Structure formats: structure tokens, C-alpha cells
Design a protein around this ligand. Structure first.
Ligand SMILES: *[C@@H]1O[C@H](CO)[C@@H](O)[C@H](O)[C@H]1NC(C)=O
Lengths: 128, 195
């Protein structure tokens, strides 16, 4: 088992940039990939980005590709979501997830049901 | 001064086959009869040696290689075999002298919803040499364009989880494997049979 704790959410003006963190503790040696997901009020949970723990290759949903960056610090067992060029459409609760499942195919981490989930952090993007 | 075969065969944790474990046995009496009389094993094949003649032989070292693979791959842990395990994960030499021991570990290594902790190497540019161990995680170029260490189209991570669930057919169930290698170098022969 691992425990995922997210931080860094809050209010930001459109066009700004914010970094979310997710600290992983417990059985950290098991980590194969980390993923970020978001849920806006009244919408289904949506995949944002995934990163392979070994090598750091990243996979992005189309709605954030070119704007968001995912990175991970192995020594600190932390994954980061750098949310650049914030838009009103980015307002949501962001959740980090961990899996020990190793796929040869990075894109599978967009649809894999993960093993453990963070508590969620609210990001609210203000007008103009 | 009994050889610590218990530590090998009764280990709670076993290695992924790509990153197979080797235990060096030395400075002990080896009671091989505890293995070959046991009903705990379903595979017990010895090439160019019989566990009954080991009881009055001395070696400089004995090596016990251990890992998990699925049932259908146990046939690949033999001299002259081909397949993903023999080619990319764990290779025996054509003239192997030693023993291959396996048992079904469904009760330990499978879990409801799937255990994905055991990995294998799915891709490699060339076959392993005998007893070579590759733990590299270089992105594998499957297509005609170089990867430059970035995953994408035709550019794959080389390792893959097995999926062990208790309801799998026996061919897809986890098996624990131990391979015994016997070595005699220019040193005192410190691993002896009870005679
Ligand atoms: C492993 O432990 C069991 C006790 O349940 C015993 O039967 C067996 O001899 C042990 N294996 C070795 C190789 O010592």
C-alpha cells in the first residue's frame, strides 16, 4: 500500500501558472507510474497526465498537451503537475494516483485503473 | 554448518525473472536428500548429475538462482530452449550441468484483482548469453526511428508485469524456480555432501 497526499491548489488568474505536488509514502519501491486526474463539478473524472517512474517519460491528455508538464523527484517520492497558461476550463478537483502495474505501453496509463488515490486539491481559475 | 537451502526455497519474497537472484552457497554440508525426497516440487530435472551422487561430492561453490515465471514458461528453463524467458530474461548454457526445480506458487504469488509485482523483459536487441542478467530500462526502439530515451510510437518500455490471479489456468499461474549450479575451481572444496 502507498499513501498519496496532494498540495498546492488554490485561486489563480487565467494565464498564470501553478504547481501541484503529490507526496508518496509507504511501499514507495513498488511505484511504476503516477497519474493526475481532475473532476469538475457535474462532470466525470478525466485523465490529465501520467509519468513513468523509471525514465520519466510522460503522457498527456489532448486538453492539456503543450500547457501542463508532469515531473517526478524519485529521491523525494514526489510527482508535480506544472499547470501553465491556466484557463477557466481547468477549474476542478485534481487527484494524483499511483500504480505498481508495469505496462510496456505508456498510453495504457491513461485508462489503467490505478491502485491508490490522493484526497484531491481544488484549483479555481479566476476571470481574464 | 548446514547449507542454508531453507533461505532459498522458503524465501517469502522471490525475484522478478529479469532481475533474477543468485545466492552463493559455501562453507557448509549440503543435504541434497531434503530436496530430492521432498513432495514440494513438480519439476526436478538434473542435467549431467544426479542429486543422489551429489551426497558424496565436494564443490568450491553452489549457486542457487531464483525467480518467478508463469507455468507455460517453466519448459524454457532448460538447455537449448528459446522463447521470451530463455532469450531475454534467464538463459542456461547448452552444456548446463545442474538442476532445475520448480513448484506452483499460486497460493503465495496470485491475488484477487491480479498481482502485478512480477515483471519480465518483453523486448531486447539481442539474446542473452548464458547466465547474463540485464536489469537495464533503456527505451526499446521497435520501429525505424531512434527513441533518444523518450517513450512514444514504436518506442517502448522494455519490462511488463505478469498478471497473476488465483482463477488463471495453470499455464498462466505463477511458478517459483530454483536453478542449482555446481562449481569446482582452484580453491578448497567447502560445500560437501553428508559423506
Ligand atoms: C522449507 O520449510 C519446510 C517446513 O514447512 C520444510 O519442509 C523444508 O525442508 C524447508 N526447505 C528447505 C530446503 O530447507
Amino acid at each position: 500500500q502507498v499513501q498519496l497526499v496532494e498540495s498546492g491548489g488554490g485561486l489563480m488568474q487565467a494565464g498564470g501558472s501553478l504547481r501541484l505536488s503529490c507526496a508518496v509514502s509507504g511501499r514507495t519501491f513498488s511505484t511504476a507510474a503516477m497519474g493526475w486526474f481532475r473532476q469538475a463539478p457535474g462532470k466525470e473524472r478525466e485523465f490529465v497526465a501520467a509519468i513513468r517512474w523509471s525514465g520519466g517519460s510522460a503522457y498527456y491528455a489532448d486538453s492539456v498537451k503543450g500547457r501542463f508538464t508532469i515531473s517526478r523527484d524519485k529521491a523525494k517520492n514526489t510527482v508535480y503537475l506544472q499547470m501553465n497558461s491556466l484557463k477557466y476550463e481547468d477549474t476542478a478537483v485534481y487527484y494524483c494516483a499511483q500504480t505498481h502495474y508495469v505496462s510496456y505501453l505508456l498510453s495504457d496509463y491513461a485508462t489503467w485503473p490505478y491502485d491508490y488515490w490522493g484526497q484531491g486539491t481544488q484549483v479555481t481559475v479566476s476571470s481574464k | 554448518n548446514l547449507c542454508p537451502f531453507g533461505e532459498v526455497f522458503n524465501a517469502t519474497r522471490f525475484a522478478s525473472v529479469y532481475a533474477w537472484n543468485r545466492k552463493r552457497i559455501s562453507n557448509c554440508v549440503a543435504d541434497y536428500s531434503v530436496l530430492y525426497n521432498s513432495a514440494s516440487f513438480s519439476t526436478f530435472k538434473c542435467y549431467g548429475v544426479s542429486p543422489t551422487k551429489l551426497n558424496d561430492l565436494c564443490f568450491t561453490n553452489v549457486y542457487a538462482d531464483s525467480f518467478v515465471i508463469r507455468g507455460d514458461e517453466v519448459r524454457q528453463i532448460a538447455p537449448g530452449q528459446t522463447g521470451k524467458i530463455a532469450d531475454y530474461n534467464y538463459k542456461l548454457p547448452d552444456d548446463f550441468t545442474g538442476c532445475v526445480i520448480a513448484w506452483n506458487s499460486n497460493n503465495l504469488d496470485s491475488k484477487v484483482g491480479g498481482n502485478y509485482n512480477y515483471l519480465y523483459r518483453l523486448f531486447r536487441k539481442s539474446n542473452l548469453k548464458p547466465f547474463e542478467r540485464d536489469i537495464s530500462t533503456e527505451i526499446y526502439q521497435a520501429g525505424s526511428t531512434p527513441c533518444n530515451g523518450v517513450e512514444g510510437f514504436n518506442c517502448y518500455f522494455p519490462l511488463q508485469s505478469y498478471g497473476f490471479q488465483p482463477t488463471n489456468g495453470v499455464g498462466y499461474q505463477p511458478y517459483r524456480v530454483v536453478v542449482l549450479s555446481f562449481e569446482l575451481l582452484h580453491a578448497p572444496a567447502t560445500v560437501c555432501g553428508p559423506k
